[PDB]
Amino acid sequence: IGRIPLWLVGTVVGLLAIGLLAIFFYGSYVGLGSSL
Amino acid sequence: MARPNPNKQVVELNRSSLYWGLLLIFVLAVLFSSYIFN
Amino acid sequence: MARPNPNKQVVELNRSSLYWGLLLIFVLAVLFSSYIFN
Amino acid sequence: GVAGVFGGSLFSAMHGSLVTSSLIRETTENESANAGYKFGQEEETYNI
Amino acid sequence: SVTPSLKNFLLSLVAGAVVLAAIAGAVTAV
Amino acid sequence: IFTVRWLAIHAIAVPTIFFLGAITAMQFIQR
Amino acid sequence: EVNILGLTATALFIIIPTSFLLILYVKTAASE
Amino acid sequence: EVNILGLTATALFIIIPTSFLLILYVKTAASE
Amino acid sequence: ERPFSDILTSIRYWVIHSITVPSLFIAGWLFVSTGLAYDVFGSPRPNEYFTEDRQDAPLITDRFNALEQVKKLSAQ
Amino acid sequence: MEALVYTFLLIGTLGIIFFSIFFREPPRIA
Amino acid sequence: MEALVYTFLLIGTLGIIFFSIFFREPPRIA
Amino acid sequence: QRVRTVLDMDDPAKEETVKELRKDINN
Amino acid sequence: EPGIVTPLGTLLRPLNSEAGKVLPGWGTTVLMAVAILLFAVFLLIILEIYNSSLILDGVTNSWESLA
Amino acid sequence: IGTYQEKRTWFDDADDWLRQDRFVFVGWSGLLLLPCAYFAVGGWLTGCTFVTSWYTHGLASSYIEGCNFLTAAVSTPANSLGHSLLFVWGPEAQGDLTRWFQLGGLWAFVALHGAFGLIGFMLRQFEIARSVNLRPYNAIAFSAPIAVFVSVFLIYPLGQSGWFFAPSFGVASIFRFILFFQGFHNWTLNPFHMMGVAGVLGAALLCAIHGATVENTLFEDGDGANTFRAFNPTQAEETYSMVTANRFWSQIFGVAFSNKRWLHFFMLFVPVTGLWMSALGVVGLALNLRAYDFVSQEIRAAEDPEFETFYTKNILLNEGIRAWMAAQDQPHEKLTLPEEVLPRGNAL
Amino acid sequence: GLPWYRVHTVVINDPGRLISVHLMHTALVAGWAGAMTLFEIAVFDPSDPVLNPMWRQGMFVLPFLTRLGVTQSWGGWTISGETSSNPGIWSYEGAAASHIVLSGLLFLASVWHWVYWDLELFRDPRTGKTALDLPKIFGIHLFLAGLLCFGFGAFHVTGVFGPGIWVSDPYGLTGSVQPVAPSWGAEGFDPYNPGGVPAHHIAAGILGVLAGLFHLCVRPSIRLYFGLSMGSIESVLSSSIAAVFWAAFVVAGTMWYGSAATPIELFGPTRYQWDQGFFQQEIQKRVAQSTSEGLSVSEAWAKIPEKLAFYDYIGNNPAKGGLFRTGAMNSGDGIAVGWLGHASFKDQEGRELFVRRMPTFFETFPVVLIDKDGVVRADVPFRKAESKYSIEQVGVSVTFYGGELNGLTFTDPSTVKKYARKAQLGEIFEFDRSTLQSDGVFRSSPRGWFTFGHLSFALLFFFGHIWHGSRTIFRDVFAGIDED
Ligand code: CLA
Ligand code: CLA
Ligand code: CLA
Ligand SMILES: CC(C)=CCC/C(C)=C/CC/C(C)=C/CC/C(C)=C/CC/C(C)=C/CC/C(C)=C/CC/C(C)=C/CC/C(C)=C/CC/C(C)=C/CC1=CC(=O)C(C)=C(C)C1=O
Ligand SMILES: CCCCCCCCCCCCCCCC(=O)OC[C@H](COP(=O)(O)OC[C@@H](O)CO)OC(=O)CCCCCCCCCCCCCCC
Ligand SMILES: CC1=C(/C=C/C(C)=C/C=C/C(C)=C/C=C/C=C(C)/C=C/C=C(C)/C=C/C2=C(C)CCCC2(C)C)C(C)(C)CCC1
Ligand SMILES: CC1=C(/C=C/C(C)=C\C=C/C(C)=C/C=C/C=C(C)/C=C/C=C(C)/C=C/C2=C(C)CCCC2(C)C)C(C)(C)CCC1
Ligand SMILES: CC1=C(/C=C/C(C)=C\C=C\C(C)=C\C=C\C=C(C)\C=C\C=C(C)\C=C\C2=C(C)CCCC2(C)C)C(C)(C)CCC1
Ligand SMILES: [Fe+2]
Ligand code: NA
């Protein structure tokens, strides 16, 4: 209980979510679904 | 002479005049349907 | 339970309901006249 | 915008249902359930 | 005769029976 | 715990994470 | 091929007066 | 010319529900 | 009651979730990278869309012989 | 419908006269 | 006859709107 | 009579025909 | 207060003489559930027959069936 | 029940376990809602991810091949497969899951399970409303979207030649379905669709206007300027001045609501009515009954090359949509129509 | 007072007045049935039952009449191509006037029950309050329903005492009202088998009688009684609405999908028959069979009947109308007066081209003449300025082999384009459009109108059932809870 911050946990989850969104958007310009 | 109308009257249609009017309408109907259909 | 019906009720339609009914009927006629006349 | 108009209809139906269900009995299947008290009191109706 | 569609339908109703049996056991548990 | 909340949260969480991994993997395939 | 003009004429000349007299009779019987 | 069927349909769809709503209104206001 | 606000702060959650969640991420990696998704769900790879016999989109034209037609015109 | 409308009108007349005979208002004032 | 039908229904609905706006029942209970 | 002709001559007029759709694996 | 006494009314009176007269326990709930299950299986059978998805030897599900 | 002994059976224990205050309510209808909705969302998410459409439609509808969330979808089966329910044990699949997915049986799976999940969930609104004892107007309200689901995903493909004309579960798939009804059915012109549009737009209108009116009549109720904390769930007074609101809209719009029972019933009424009328419209379109032609307009435009309307432009544009889209949209039709029979404008 | 949507709730607790409104409705629907039958007899033209069938004339209740046995009327005609036999009292107009007399009798009975409503039959003996024993009432009506189903299945449809069913040819050529023997096997559940209906009715009536016996002798359970509120009339209202829209869904589904209970000679072809090339493959295989042995073209096609070519025409299709494309299909694109024949198209060097037909979804489809294999060889061009597919340079010629037009081949003028456009719809027919001031757009079949109305009503009654189920389950919160 309270050993690592809840706000910091939310920050780490947010960094992973933004990273996944960035990876998904990056995959649209390269490879399959890149029209090239 | 005031806001409500003292000349207001209610309508009365008894059953005898009802039956007479209905008979009148349907007798006019049987008389003129054959002629409008022509 | 007697000679008159105990379940007799009166009907109430205020001016708002009158307006809503007339609006519904007239807008329905407005919409569907172009299709009925075609 | 499509999500918002569909959600606006959804939230309209939802709010309407949740607060027309939350009715303390002042309007019965007659015009109103005034037998408890007639019009003219601050005793508020409904529930939230 | 016993058409493959009918045989598969019989196995299908048996499978549905055991699926609802497992669901009943699960809702009986927990 | 293995209560109804445990079962519901895990039934939602496990395949979402599994498929998120699968899609992140599919982000790097070239024709 | 069905004379709809005469049909609607007969239908209206029945319906409008019988309904009107029924309204008047109902208000006479209700309000004595 | 003139679509008499459509004219009749539109005319009755006006008058009959309109007369219905008006008659309940005037009978409701007659006996409040 | 665990209203979900305490478990994230607790390190005991992340003791076992630093293995299960990356294990599922790696499981998805091997699942699609080993072609198992293609093999299980019938997904065709990018180099097996137009075979030598037909150069256009595959056409269906059947109801009852559907499985025999997929054995005819699948990705070999 | 040629004969049917005259049939409706004749039946209406018969029903009206039947109701006027039987479902009439009772004769009051002498 | 087509055009006057549309004109009449439109101006009639506008008339009902006008009548409901200015000659409504005065509001009660709040 | 001639089974291959009658399907093939229903083919240009209407391709959704039962005669064309049944037993299309052999074609 | 008393209703109008009627000959056909007192004829058919026993058929309305047991309003609410109800058996306790669960009754035949198991039997009606079994009947509903058999009825649902029969309905699924006729559905899959009428879907051309339960092929039988004699049923063709086509206009040729009445040929 | 009703002052009886009511000797406890397995039904009583099962009902007592099903009606408990949990993280998510289960109830008796949870026997249907939870598994059916689970397979519905799982099938849609898997078919958007792995299950392809290179068999059925001959196009890409999966995450594995280059389709985004806006592009991938659970595609419908093919017209040649008819209205078959496509069971795993059905004659099409014959118990092969790998080729069941490829023939599009997952679409029928998701559609049937989504229907039964809808049944279970709105049954659950009955179960909750009975558990805590108020009217199920939530169920009467949600009766309209399930009618929409029935009319769109079941009644229309049942009336058509097969599930191929059903809406595939997706984003661009529903977009294609919308454009299909535009080109082939003239679905904008149908009055039932017009009443559906009116109902939903009026419902969004009512939601926005009611929320804003309540929020701008919220009284003082405190000294902090954050008015949300100025509300107290304990207090029995109204959070908003409905008198002030009524006189405001009486002087702005002319007519205003005077009874909040009528207000909230009307904002319940408009979307349900609109969805029900549009559902009846889709029921009409299921049998290819469409509001397509205005016979006076085509007759007068035929005898006079000078008369035209935006309606006439829309009809000709519908012919364009049909001609240029059905060629690949309906692969079973073998539409190898050349370009000189496909119609054009000048320079385009 | 009472809201306008509530005026009928005054008789929820008055069984006598419930009888009154039920009998009033029965009178109204009986009068409507009689009026519609006489109206459709007045509009009906039996001059050409071969080429101008009643389902092409917007006929709705006469096909339900003919399906069950009545085939002739009082005027001296029969729709089966024969002259009238002895008509008796049970003709079309006889049934209409009989339903009118029923309407009057039911009207007078409704008035009687309205006036006399407090019968002791409606009063409970133990408590003295007005009550109805709904499980016993249901047992009674289940016994009568089983008896009526058994009588209709063992006496009418079997032909031992009734006439049978209007059965037909598989392609809608030869059909009449005849008895059919029941089938107890799998073919008994064959939907297109006419023999399944008598076995269906016999088994269903027997089962209904036995179930009525259990409902008469056995009482319900307390748990079930407080479960679905059997002691209330709103529960039986909701359940009855549920059952009737279930039946409406069944009827609409069978009407669209075709059945032995849906004769093609009374209701027209099917959209699935058109899309699946049913009459087309029939006509073509008959021609191929006649060509294979003996007779050649231009006389073998004359062996093709007048009915089948009319059936193979999308203007007869139920899936081509509109909501407001109103009236008979004859009023749409004229009355059919004759069959031209099969338009045969040849190229300049000589090879048979085929016209691509117009599917149900398309209001307008391109007219293309495609090769024997399935290659595009000619088309009516939009640009008319490019390629080698325009008719005047490809050189196609239209031949015909049928009734009115058999051996005059056209190659030069726009007549070949006109006949390609006409045959692109199916078989080419002459229609007269001046008799009914016919317009040209495609009207809807009576099947389509039936199925549209009953699907919409079934879904609306789904709303009615779910609402009355809500009201019945939740009668405590709809009426009042009084601060608890
Ligand atoms: C003296 C009794 C009588 C007789 C002999 C007839 C005879 C006829 N009627 Mg009629 N009718 C009657 C009474 C009668 N009617 C009454 C009292 C009413 C008022 C409700 C009607 C209202 C009526 C209408 C609206 C119509 C007819 C029509 C017809 C004609 C064709 C019927 C048909 O083939 O459709 C087929 C009949 C059916 C498909 C009924 C099926 C019954 C369903 C399946 C019951 C399902 C629920 C059931 C209780 C379940 C049982 C469960 C089991 C286990 C027991 C036919 C000549 C039709 C016509 O041609 O117009 C004149 C038509 O339009 N009638
Ligand atoms: C569900 C029952 C049913 C069915 C399937 C049919 C089917 C049919 N009827 Mg019919 N009819 C019925 C009930 C039914 N009818 C009833 C109860 C009546 C008494 C009023 C009539 C009276 C009647 C007449 C007089 C005629 C027909 C005719 C026909 C045939 C032509 C198509 C048509 O109906 O026009 C088109 C159908 C529509 C345009 C449907 C309207 C779409 C919806 C309902 C509009 C919604 C209402 C809307 C608010 C109205 C606003 C409009 C307003 C502005 C005027 C057709 C096969 C014609 C015929 O062929 O004669 C034999 C004919 O002349 N019917
Ligand atoms: C045979 C089926 C049936 C029966 C017996 C009832 C009976 C009843 N309903 Mg109900 N209902 C039904 C089906 C049925 N309903 C369906 C299908 C729907 C979905 C549309 C509803 C939706 C519904 C609602 C929302 C409500 C009721 C209500 C009521 C109660 C009083 C309303 C009333 O009748 O006053 C008179 C009705 C009118 C004056 C309606 C006006 C006439 C309409 C607009 C046009 C009529 C056209 C023509 C004459 C007939 C065409 C219909 C026919 C072809 C089917 C009453 C006991 C009320 C209730 O629940 O009580 C609390 C209520 O508010 N019903
Ligand atoms: C020459 C000329 C005139 C040319 C015009 C030609 C022309 C284009 C004509 C138009 C044709 C025509 C009418 C087309 C429309 C046809 C159409 C689709 C009709 C729909 C018909 C129909 C039956 C639809 C069914 C669906 C349905 C029920 C929709 C109803 C929609 C509807 C009425 C919505 C409500 C609208 C609205 C203004 C909401 C009220 C909001 C408001 C005033 C709140 C006030 C308020 C808010 C509070 O929060 C509080 C607290 C208080 C107190 C309070 O007061
Ligand atoms: C310069 C000012 C600008 C505004 C002028 C234009 C405003 C138009 C007035 C709104 C319409 C009035 C509706 C009457 C119906 C009416 O007044 O009902 C009456 C109702 C008031 O009900 P109450 O609150 O009195 O109900 C409680 C009672 O039971 C107790 O007394 O009004 C409303 O529900 C709120 C207004 C909704 C307005 C609905 C919008 C209707 C759209 C009309 C579209 C017409 C078709 C196109 C035109 C051809
Ligand atoms: C008294 C009497 C009698 C009889 C009489 C009569 C003759 C009656 C009748 C009657 C009738 C003759 C009836 C009919 C009717 C009709 C109806 C009943 C109808 C209707 C309607 C509806 C329901 C509609 C609806 C709708 C609309 C609105 C439009 C279109 C669409 C729809 C469908 C939605 C006699 C002497 C014999 C004997 C005994 C006594
Ligand atoms: C198919 C099928 C099945 C079933 C299954 C299931 C039931 C499951 C599942 C599942 C699931 C359930 C899945 C999932 C997925 C998900 C995902 C893939 C996600 C996502 C993505 C994204 C992109 C996101 C974003 C976001 C948002 C928007 C929200 C929040 C924030 C974030 C950022 C996270 C089986 C095999 C049995 C058999 C039959 C068929
Ligand atoms: C909890 C939360 C969340 C999450 C969030 C996040 C994710 C956050 C973050 C964030 C971050 C993560 C941030 C960062 C930052 C940083 C910054 C902003 C900085 C800076 C600075 C500068 C300006 C720079 C400069 C420079 C240059 C220019 C280059 C190189 C060198 C140097 C470094 C000097 C969510 C939404 C889910 C929910 C709600 C809340
Ligand atoms: Fe509110
Ligand atoms: Na252009």
User: What is the DSSP track for B22-38?
Assistant: HHHHHHHHHHHHHHHH-
CB proximity list for N250: less than 8 A, separation 6 or greater: K27, N256
> With an 8 Å Cβ cutoff, are N65 and A34 in contact?
no
CB proximity list for O46: less than 8 A, separation 6 or greater: O77, O78, O79
Counting one residue from H and one from K, how many pairs have CB atoms under 8 Å apart?
Answer: 8
Q: How far is CA E28 from the centre of its chain?
A: 19
Q: Do chains C and N touch (3 or more CB pairs under 8 A)?
A: yes
Residues from L in contact with I at Cβ < 8 Å: 20-25
What resolution in angstroms does the PDB record give?
4.0
Technique behind this structure?
A: cryo-EM
Reported as type and span, the H/E element at residue O398 is strand O397-398
How far is ligand 5, taken at its centre, from the CA of residue N243, in Å? 17
Q: Among the bound ligands, name the one nearest to the CA of residue N241.
A: 4
Q: Which domain holds residue N172?
A: 1-348
- b vs e for N235-267, b when ≥16 Cβ sit within 10 Å of the residue's Cβ? eeebbbbbeebbeeebeeeebbbbbbbbbbebb
Taken in order of first residue, the domains within chain I and their CATH numbers are 4-73 (1.20.5.860)
Q: How many domains in chain N?
A: 1
Position O385, amino acid? A
Q: Among the bound ligands, name the one nearest to the CA of residue O457.
A: 3
Structure-derived torsion over alpha carbons of residues H10, H13, H15, H21, reported in degrees to the nearest 10: -150
Taking the CA of residue K16 as reference, the ligand 5 atom at the shortest distance is: 14
Residue of F19, F24, F27 to mutate, testing the N interface (most N Cβ within 10 Å of its Cβ) = F19
Class of residue N157 by CB neighbours under 10 A (exposed 0-12, middle 13-18, buried 19+): buried
Cα distance between residue F7 and residue H9, in whole Å: 61
H-only helix segments in O268-337? 271-275, 278-292, 306-311, 330-333
Cα distance between residue N176 and residue N326, in whole Å: 11
Q: Are O313 and O429 in contact (CB under 8 A)?
A: yes
Q: Are O31 and O110 in contact (CB under 8 A)?
A: no
CA distances from F18 to I26, I27, N8, N34, N70 (A): 8, 7, 44, 21, 21
Cα distance between residue O441 and residue O323, in whole Å: 12
Residue N150 tokens read as: 């029935």
Cα distance between residue O401 and residue O341, in whole Å: 5
Rg (CA), chain N: 26
Q: What is the 3-state secondary structure (H, E, C) of O177-211?
A: EECCCCCCCHHHHCCCCCCHHHHHHHHHHHHHHHH
Position J2, amino acid? E
Pairing of strands N169-170, O376-379: unpaired
Cα distance between residue N260 and residue N50, in whole Å: 50
| Nearest Cα residue to C5 out of O122, O110, O117 | O117
Structure-derived torsion over alpha carbons of residues N292, N296, N299, N305, reported in degrees to the nearest 10: -100
Residue N59 tokens read as: 């196009």
Give me the half-sphere count of Cα atoms (radius 13 Å) on the Cβ side of residue O442.
21
Nearest CA in chain N to F31: N65
Q: How far is N43 from chain A (nearest CA, A)?
A: 22
Q: How far is M51 from chain N (nearest CA, A)?
A: 6
Q: Are O389 and O378 in contact (CB under 8 A)?
A: yes
Residue C5 tokens read as: 């019906």
A5: Cβ below 6 Å to ligand 8?
no
Taking the CA of residue N258 as reference, the ligand 5 atom at the shortest distance is: 24
- b vs e for O432-461, b when ≥16 Cβ sit within 10 Å of the residue's Cβ? eeeebebbebbbbbbbbbbbbebbbbbbbb
Nearest CA in chain L to I59: L24
Q: How far is CA O251 from the centre of its chain?
A: 9
Residue B18 tokens read as: 């009802």
Residues of N in contact with L15 (CB under 8 A): 332-334
I partners (3+ CB pairs within 8 A) are: A, F, L, N
F 1-30 → I contacts, CB under 8 A:
14, 17-26
The dihedral of CA N75, N81, N83, N86: what is its sign? Answer: negative
Residues with CB under 6 A from ligand 6: J 8, 11, 15; O 28, 31-32, 35, 100-101, 103-105, 107-108
Tokens 């702005």, located at residue: N252
By alpha-carbon position, which residue is closest to atom 31 of ligand 4?
N202
Residue O106 tokens read as: 């039911």
Q: How many CB atoms lie within 10 A of CB O236?
A: 20
Q: Are L17 and O280 in contact (CB under 8 A)?
A: yes
Residues with CB under 6 A from ligand 1: O 26, 29-30, 33, 37, 61, 64-65, 67-68, 95, 99, 142, 145-146, 149, 204, 207-208, 247
| Nearest Cα residue to N32 out of N147, N136, N115, N140 | N115
| Helix-helix angle O92-115:O15-43, to 10 degrees | 160
Residues of D in contact with N274 (CB under 8 A): 9
Q: How many CB atoms lie within 10 A of CB O58?
A: 21
3-state secondary structure of N28: coil
Q: How many CB atoms lie within 10 A of CB B9?
A: 6
| Nearest Cα residue to L1 out of E20, O290, B34 | O290
Annotated binding-site members of N for a plastoquinone: 210, 257
- One DSSP character per residue, N237-277 reads S-SS-HHHHHHHHHHHTS-----HHHHHHHHHHHHHHHHHH
The dihedral of CA N332, N336, N342, N347: what is its sign? Answer: positive
| Nearest Cα residue to I66 out of L11, N94, L14 | N94
- Whether N90 has its CB under 8 Å from any CB of chain E: the answer is yes
Residue A9 tokens read as: 């946990």
Cα distance between residue N253 and residue C18, in whole Å: 19
* E strand map for chain N: 73-74, 169-170
Tell me the β-bridge partners of O432: O335
Q: What is the 3-state secondary structure (H, E, C) of chain M?
A: CCCECCHHHHHCCHHHCCCCCCECCCCCHHHHHHHHHHHHHHHHHHHHHHCCCCCCCCCCCCHHHHC
> With an 8 Å Cβ cutoff, are C37 and N194 in contact?
no
Q: Do chains O and C touch (3 or more CB pairs under 8 A)?
A: yes
Q: Are J6 and B30 in contact (CB under 8 A)?
A: yes
3-state secondary structure of O49: coil
The count of residues in chain L is 27
By alpha-carbon position, which residue is closest to atom 11 of ligand 6?
O31
Q: Do chains D and F touch (3 or more CB pairs under 8 A)?
A: no
- b vs e for O323-361, b when ≥16 Cβ sit within 10 Å of the residue's Cβ? bbbbebbbbbbbbbeebbbbbbbbbeeeeebbbbbbbbb
- b vs e for O118-131, b when ≥16 Cβ sit within 10 Å of the residue's Cβ? bbbbbbbeeeeebb
Q: Are I70 and N103 in contact (CB under 8 A)?
A: yes
Farthest CA pair distance, chain G: 49
> With an 8 Å Cβ cutoff, are B22 and G9 in contact?
no
Taking the CA of residue O145 as reference, the ligand 1 atom at the shortest distance is: 55
How is residue N302 annotated by DSSP?
H
- Whether C37 has its CB under 8 Å from any CB of chain N: the answer is yes
I54 is an annotated ligand-binding site residue: no
Pairing of strands O345-346, O335-341: unpaired
Cα distance between residue D15 and residue A35, in whole Å: 46
Cα distance between residue N62 and residue N73, in whole Å: 6
Residue O10 tokens read as: 């005054």
How is residue N154 annotated by DSSP?
I
Cα distance between residue B5 and residue B16, in whole Å: 30
I2 is an annotated ligand-binding site residue: yes
Tell me the β-bridge partners of M23: O221
Residue K3 tokens read as: 């055009």
Q: How far is CA M28 from the centre of its chain?
A: 15
Cα distance between residue J13 and residue D12, in whole Å: 55
F17 is an annotated ligand-binding site residue: no
